[PDB]
Design a protein around this ligand. Sequence first.
Ligand SMILES: [Cl-]
Ligand SMILES: [Cl-]
Ligand SMILES: [Cl-]
Ligand code: NA
Ligand SMILES: [Ru+3]
Ligand SMILES: [Ru+3]
Ligand SMILES: [Ru+3]
Length: 129
Amino acid sequence: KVFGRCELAAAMKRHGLDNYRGYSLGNWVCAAKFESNFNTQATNRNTDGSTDYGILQINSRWWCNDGRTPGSRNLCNIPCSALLSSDITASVNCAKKIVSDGNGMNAWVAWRNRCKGTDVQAWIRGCRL
Ligand SMILES: [Cl-]
Ligand SMILES: [Cl-]
Ligand SMILES: [Cl-]
Ligand code: NA
Ligand SMILES: [Ru+3]
Ligand SMILES: [Ru+3]
Ligand SMILES: [Ru+3]
């Protein structure tokens, strides 16, 4: 599923991301925009052989099992395929664990490079949440 911007903002808020670990909803929408262009099915191979999955590009090196990332953990206890579903529950739940893990949203390199420090509120401007 490719979400619209306000549609995903609304879904993210419903699933408990607004101000989760202190990150306003616009941060999450901005991260999703630049990680996956709001497409739940996005997948991208990393140089190290891991792959990133879903609307938030969650990495198989640490967070999910895809059966092809040697040496990796599965800290969200889910198949990476679950991260591709039209329902964002697994992505959101796993993202909560990631953002709790110590470096906050800097875990998403696109968030650090494209969202952090910017007017992230613009991403939810005009939305009926
Ligand atoms: Cl957009
Ligand atoms: Cl933080
Ligand atoms: Cl980037
Ligand atoms: Na893994
Ligand atoms: Ru809010
Ligand atoms: Ru990545
Ligand atoms: Ru939902």
